[PDB]
Amino acid sequence: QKRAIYPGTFDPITNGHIDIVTRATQMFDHVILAIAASPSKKPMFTLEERVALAQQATAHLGNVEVVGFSDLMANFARNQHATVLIRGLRAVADFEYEMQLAHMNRHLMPELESVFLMPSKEWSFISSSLVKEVARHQGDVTHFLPENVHQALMAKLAV
Amino acid sequence: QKRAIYPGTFDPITNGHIDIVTRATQMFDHVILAIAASPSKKPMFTLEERVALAQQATAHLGNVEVVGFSDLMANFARNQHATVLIRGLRAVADFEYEMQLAHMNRHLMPELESVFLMPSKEWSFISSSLVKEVARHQGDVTHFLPENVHQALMAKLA
Amino acid sequence: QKRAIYPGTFDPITNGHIDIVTRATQMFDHVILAIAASPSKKPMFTLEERVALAQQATAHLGNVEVVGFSDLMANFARNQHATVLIRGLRAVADFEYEMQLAHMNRHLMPELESVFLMPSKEWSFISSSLVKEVARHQGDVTHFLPENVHQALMAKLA
Amino acid sequence: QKRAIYPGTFDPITNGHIDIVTRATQMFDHVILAIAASPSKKPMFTLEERVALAQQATAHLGNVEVVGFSDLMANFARNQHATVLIRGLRAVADFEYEMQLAHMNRHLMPELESVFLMPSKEWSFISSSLVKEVARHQGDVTHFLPENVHQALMAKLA
Amino acid sequence: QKRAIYPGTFDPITNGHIDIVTRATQMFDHVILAIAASPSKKPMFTLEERVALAQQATAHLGNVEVVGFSDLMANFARNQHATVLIRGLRAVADFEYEMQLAHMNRHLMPELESVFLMPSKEWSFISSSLVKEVARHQGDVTHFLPENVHQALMAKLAV
Amino acid sequence: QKRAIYPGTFDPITNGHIDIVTRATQMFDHVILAIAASPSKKPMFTLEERVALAQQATAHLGNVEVVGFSDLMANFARNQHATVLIRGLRAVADFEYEMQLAHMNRHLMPELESVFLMPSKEWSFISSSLVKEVARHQGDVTHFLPENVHQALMAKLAV
Ligand SMILES: CC1(C)OC(=O)c2ccccc2[C@H]1n1cncc1C(F)F
Numbered sequence: 001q002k003r004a005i006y007p008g009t010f011d012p013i014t015n016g017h018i019d020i021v022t023r024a025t026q027m028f029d030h031v032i033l034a035i036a037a038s039p040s041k042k043p044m045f046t047l048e049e050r051v052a053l054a055q056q057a058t059a060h061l062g063n064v065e066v067v068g069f070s071d072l073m074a075n076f077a078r079n080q081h082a083t084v085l086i087r088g089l090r091a092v093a094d095f096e097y098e099m100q101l102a103h104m105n106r107h108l109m110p111e112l113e114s115v116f117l118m119p120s121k122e123w124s125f126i127s128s129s130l131v132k133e134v135a136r137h138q139g140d141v142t143h144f145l146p147e148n149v150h151q152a153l154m155a156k157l158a159v
Numbered sequence: 160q161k162r163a164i165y166p167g168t169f170d171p172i173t174n175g176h177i178d179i180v181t182r183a184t185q186m187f188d189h190v191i192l193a194i195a196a197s198p199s200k201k202p203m204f205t206l207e208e209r210v211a212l213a214q215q216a217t218a219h220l221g222n223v224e225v226v227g228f229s230d231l232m233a234n235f236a237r238n239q240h241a242t243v244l245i246r247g248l249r250a251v252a253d254f255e256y257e258m259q260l261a262h263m264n265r266h267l268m269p270e271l272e273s274v275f276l277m278p279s280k281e282w283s284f285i286s287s288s289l290v291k292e293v294a295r296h297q298g299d300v301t302h303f304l305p306e307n308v309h310q311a312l313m314a315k316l317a
Numbered sequence: 318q319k320r321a322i323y324p325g326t327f328d329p330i331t332n333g334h335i336d337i338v339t340r341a342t343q344m345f346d347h348v349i350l351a352i353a354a355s356p357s358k359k360p361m362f363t364l365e366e367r368v369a370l371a372q373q374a375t376a377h378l379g380n381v382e383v384v385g386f387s388d389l390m391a392n393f394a395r396n397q398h399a400t401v402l403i404r405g406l407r408a409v410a411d412f413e414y415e416m417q418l419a420h421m422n423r424h425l426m427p428e429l430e431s432v433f434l435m436p437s438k439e440w441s442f443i444s445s446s447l448v449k450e451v452a453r454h455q456g457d458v459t460h461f462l463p464e465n466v467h468q469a470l471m472a473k474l475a
Numbered sequence: 476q477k478r479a480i481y482p483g484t485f486d487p488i489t490n491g492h493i494d495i496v497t498r499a500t501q502m503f504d505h506v507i508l509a510i511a512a513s514p515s516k517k518p519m520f521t522l523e524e525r526v527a528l529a530q531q532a533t534a535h536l537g538n539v540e541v542v543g544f545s546d547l548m549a550n551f552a553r554n555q556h557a558t559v560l561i562r563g564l565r566a567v568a569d570f571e572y573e574m575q576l577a578h579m580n581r582h583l584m585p586e587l588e589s590v591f592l593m594p595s596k597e598w599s600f601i602s603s604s605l606v607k608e609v610a611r612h613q614g615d616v617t618h619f620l621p622e623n624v625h626q627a628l629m630a631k632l633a
Numbered sequence: 634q635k636r637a638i639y640p641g642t643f644d645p646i647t648n649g650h651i652d653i654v655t656r657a658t659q660m661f662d663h664v665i666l667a668i669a670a671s672p673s674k675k676p677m678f679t680l681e682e683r684v685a686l687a688q689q690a691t692a693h694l695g696n697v698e699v700v701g702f703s704d705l706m707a708n709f710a711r712n713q714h715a716t717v718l719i720r721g722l723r724a725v726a727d728f729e730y731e732m733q734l735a736h737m738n739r740h741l742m743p744e745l746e747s748v749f750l751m752p753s754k755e756w757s758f759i760s761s762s763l764v765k766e767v768a769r770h771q772g773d774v775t776h777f778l779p780e781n782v783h784q785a786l787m788a789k790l791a792v
Numbered sequence: 793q794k795r796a797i798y799p800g801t802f803d804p805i806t807n808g809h810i811d812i813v814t815r816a817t818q819m820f821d822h823v824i825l826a827i828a829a830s831p832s833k834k835p836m837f838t839l840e841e842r843v844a845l846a847q848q849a850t851a852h853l854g855n856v857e858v859v860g861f862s863d864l865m866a867n868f869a870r871n872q873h874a875t876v877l878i879r880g881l882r883a884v885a886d887f888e889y890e891m892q893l894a895h896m897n898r899h900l901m902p903e904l905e906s907v908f909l910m911p912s913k914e915w916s917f918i919s920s921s922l923v924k925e926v927a928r929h930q931g932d933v934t935h936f937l938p939e940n941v942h943q944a945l946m947a948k949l950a951v
Pocket residue numbers: 166167168195230231232233260263264605608609612614
């Protein structure tokens with residue numbers, strides 16, 4: 001029935017992302033975890049890496065489908081027959097950008113409804129960017145990542 | 160059958176609220192528009208008045224059920240077999256309070272998932288309180304309220 | 318001849334308000350400092366008291382006219398032939414409310430253009446309410462108020 | 476010997492407050508937990524009740540002294556020979572008010588330095604007011620309050 | 634009499650900018666629409682392009698003058714005998730930066746008064762950046778731009 | 793007794809930084825002013841320059857020690873036996889990032905307590921970035937910098 005899309009760069013997927021997509025799967029029949037292919041900011045992991053890490057970290061969720069996309073998110077959501085756009089809501093500065101993005105997406109595809117989900121307090125203060133920056137400077141980010149992601153990030157930063 | 164609850168004081172229900180509940184009905188099979196008694200807010204309209212205004216203003220939506228309540232939110236949602244709690248997200252200062260509410264409601268009922276919807280730009284700068292204050296100075300608030308609500312607010316202040 | 322109106326509760330007028338209206342008079346030919354009755358805020362000073370305090374505190378500014386009003390803002394501005402509505406912008410939480418006000422006032426009078434001015438850093442962290450609360454505990458608020466206002470606040474709390 | 480004061484209404488003291496004062500005692504030699512009378516907030520508990528609840532809830536901390544006061548903050552801090560004023564920082568809307576408070580307190584006592592501490596994520600979304608409102612609807616607030624405070628809030632609402 | 638300056642990068646000018654400058658022209662006798670020449674972020678359109686697009690899109694407003702500048706804004710405003718600085722106010726995150734900018738401009742030129750105008754709800758959630766990003770990824774931004782700007786942006790992205 | 797660290801990039805140190813570190817020295821027995829060595833954003837002044845400018849501008853404060861560091865801040869604070877982390881709090885957008893940073897630092901080193909100090913109203917609206925940008929475009933930033941820093945910045949921008 002209800003098809004939802006949860007897009008992002010997921011570079012890499014964090015426990016914050018797992019919390020959001022898990023909540024989405026309890027609400028909607030099918031959830032597409034949609035990984036943006038060619039972000040303008042050179043992602044740390046390749047698209048194939050981000051997709052494979054996210055598949056592994058969500059494999060326990062029956063109704064998640066991990067797919068990469070390079071179109072405008074709204075164009076891809078339209079072609080996937082999604083009517084729900086999942087966005088994670090952490091802090092107020094996130095909120096301001098999300099409101100601009102949501103109004104633009106509504107202009108581009110009014111039949112796509114943006115829904116904002118709220119993560120656990122546990123993940124309410126992290127981001128892929130902060131995690132990467134901490135790990136790059138020899139900080140412990142084990143608590144923030146799925147184990148498979150933690151292993152790949154160590155491997156990535158070792159070289 | 161996905162059951163969602165949209166709680167609030169709705170004193171009175173505005174077009175902003177109609178926007179949110181309409182989006183909700185497009186997403187979920189059954190939506191309970193749930194009117195909190197909220198005596199501490201000293202509402203302008205009684206709970207029975209607010210319930211009847213919202214019933215009339217949502218009557219065109221097949222899958223809306225308007226109910227009044229004075230229970231703890233989490234208990235009322237459990238008792239209505241809802242697993243989704245809808246809140247409208249206007250501006251940053253609302254957002255902060257909503258996070259406290261949602262984290263409190265999650266603590267009390269972890270299977271009740273809060274979802275925030277965003278209203279049209281048309282209603283992004285109004286509130287029940289602002290409309291009431293405009294009407295208190297006899298300003299034209301027809302654009303912001305359902306007809307039946309507009310009349311009742313007029314009659315109330317006359 | 319450009320006419321601007323600077324409305325507010327001004328209970329009491331502070332140096333922050335003096336800063337804003339002074340900037341306004343440097344920009345526009347005639348500035349109406351317009352004191353809202355605001356009975357719902359239960360002001361400390363009566364409208365007549367607030368009007369006289371502001372008259373005295375702005376008397377050095379040639380092109381300020383102090384007036385009290387209880388009308389709808391948009392009507393009073395239309396009736397004063399103003400096309401500019403001045404508001405002071407302090408912090409983010411004020412900003413959110415001001416946008417709702419300005420969008421409401423624009424809806425009711427689209428030719429009334431809201432302009433926001435920014436006060437000196439010196440007054441960017443005070444408000445009428447904060448000063449009153451300090452004075453209620455006999456703290457020194459001479460730095461934040463015009464002399465005549467300081468005296469009246471003293472006399473009031475004595 | 477560094478003396479710090481942690482003022483607030485503490486109506487009632489929550490685990491969020493316990494978190495802050497505990498962090499304070501790890502940083503400063505002596506911490507005065509100072510309970511403002513705040514009659515304008517119409518507190519649920521009397522000053523004497525709030526003082527006794529906080530005394531009991533902080534009794535395990537050797538270097539906490541609980542005191543009630545109705546003075547101007549700056550005077551009470553001067554009179555207690557404190558040079559540090561502790562405030563907890565939750566969210567953006569608190570932050571704005573705290574800056575106004577700290578700049579006012581600095582004006583009145585420039586040697587009183589405000590320091591903001593950040594509570595655990597566990598308490599980052601609660602407040603005395605939110606807990607009271609939950610308890611008013613008989614929701615379970617045991618997780619948010621010290622045992623003695625939880626009992627007193629129960630007894631009060633019974 | 635009263636000379637006002639409305640500076641920005643206008644890369645490209647949007648309907649949000651037209652709304653602001655139009656409101657400014659109803660308030661002040663002469664409005665200089667001032668286009669910053671060499672922003673550090675390589676603008677999509679050249680200065681000559683931005684100026685010509687803005688001239689065309691404001692030609693109906695009698696008391697607008699479109700000019701490019703490369704000095705510090707305050708230095709240019711001083712040399713132009715402007716005493717009013719028009720800033721558009723969209724959302725709270727804009728506001729924080731605008732307050733820092735306005736206090737700096739006041740330090741640099743105290744006789745230049747910053748005034749913040751508020752755009753229509755219609756344009757309260759867009760920016761040149763978001764519009765460009767949407768258009769670059771094959772989204773429809775026709776509603777946000779003057780027709781002449783829409784034509785030039787399509788031409789720009791076709792190559 | 794109590795050792796506090798005040799880290800940053802200090803590129804260059806401003807009067808806002810002097811205000812904060814001065815308040816810190818009145819509160820804590822020893823204050824390490826810790827200058828991050830290799831920020832990802834190519835700092836205007838070298839690490840040796842930033843350290844020498846900061847030493848000169850704080851030389852009047854007896855209990856300040858200026859040191860450079862290249863580790864993760866928390867790792868350096870741990871190795872320096874600091875238990876207080878001084879952060880300066882200017883505006884709400886600062887606050888949101890500071891909360892994420894403080895929670896991360898608490899995860900990485902729970903015995904390091906973050907404390908937020910508030911600067912004078914005089915410096916509540918400036919940053920190293922805005923000062924640099926103004927100076928680079930021929931604006932007067934004399935009021936915002938220690939004299940030694942003002943001299944070095946002019947020298948830097950002359951070439
Ligand atoms: C209906 C209330 C009274 O129920 C509560 O339990 C409660 C508890 C604490 C604060 C506020 C509330 C209210 N609330 C909860 N969630 C949505 C709402 C309402 F404002 F729409």
